Amino acid sequence: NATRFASVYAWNRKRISNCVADYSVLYNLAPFFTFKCYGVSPTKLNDLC
Amino acid sequence: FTNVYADSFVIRGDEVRQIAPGQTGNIADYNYKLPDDFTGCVIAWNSNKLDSKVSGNYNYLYRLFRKSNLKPFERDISTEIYQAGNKPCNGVAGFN
């Protein structure tokens, strides 16, 4: 949801630890362009710790 | 033994580790299950020098998604689109 960004080489790393992240409102809406990855389904990430 | 049932299928080499009794995976849940009382053997062979294609082989397809857990030794011929939400799909992909 951030307005600003970074370039390809200069990218910042935001560490996500010790918090509860809600991805269930993103998957039931999906403005996201294309999800492609291997071996782990992104729709199965809701019950995983 | 009495009889033998041969199941001919092609699985990529990342997903062959889920073929064993009592696994969990994409193929190991919604496609092909092995129960704990299953008895038999697994035979595999490398088809990459024959059955592959440069632009990709679209002749075979596989199911990622199902509403519930599939019972083993059962084939799924259903062309029905998985509906996540309350919006009707009308046979095509779309919102939910």
From Swiss-Prot, chain B:
UniProt-recorded name of the protein: Spike protein S1
Residue span of region Immunodominant HLA epitope recognized by the CD8+: 57-65
Mutagenesis / variant outcome for changing residue 53 to T: In strain: Omicron/BQ.1.1
Organism: Severe acute respiratory syndrome coronavirus 2
Effect of residue 65 to L: In strain: Omicron/EG.5.1
Origin organism lineage: Viruses, Riboviria, Orthornavirae, Pisuviricota, Pisoniviricetes
Effect of residue 62 to F: In strain: B.1.1.298
Residue ranges, annotated region (Receptor-binding motif): 46-96
Assembly, per entry: Binds to host ACE2. RBD also interacts with the N-linked glycan on 'Asn-90' of ACE2. Cleavage of S generates a polybasic C-terminal sequence on S1 that binds to host Neuropilin-1 (NRP1) and Neuropilin-2 (NRP2) receptors. Interacts with host integrin alpha-5/beta-1 (ITGA5:ITGB1) and with ACE2 in complex with integrin alpha-5/beta-1 (ITGA5:ITGB1). May interact via cytoplasmic c-terminus with M protein. May interact (via N-terminus) with host bilirubin and biliverdin, thereby preventing antibody binding to the SARS-CoV-2 spike NTD via an allosteric mechanism.
Effect of residue 61 to R: In strain: Delta/B.1.617.2, Epsilon/B.1.427/B.1.429, Kappa/B.1.617.1, Lambda/C.37, 19B/501Y, Omicron/BA.4, Omicron/BA.5, Omicron/BQ.1.1; Contributes to cellular immunity evasion and increases infectivity
Function, in words: Attaches the virion to the cell membrane by interacting with host receptor, initiating the infection. The major receptor is host ACE2. When S2/S2' has been cleaved, binding to the receptor triggers direct fusion at the cell membrane. When S2/S2' has not been cleaved, binding to the receptor results in internalization of the virus by endocytosis using host TFRC and GRM2 and leading to fusion of the virion membrane with the host endosomal membrane. Alternatively, may use NRP1/NRP2 and integrin as entry receptors.
Chain spans, region Integrin-binding motif: 12-14
Top-level taxon in the UniProt lineage: Viruses
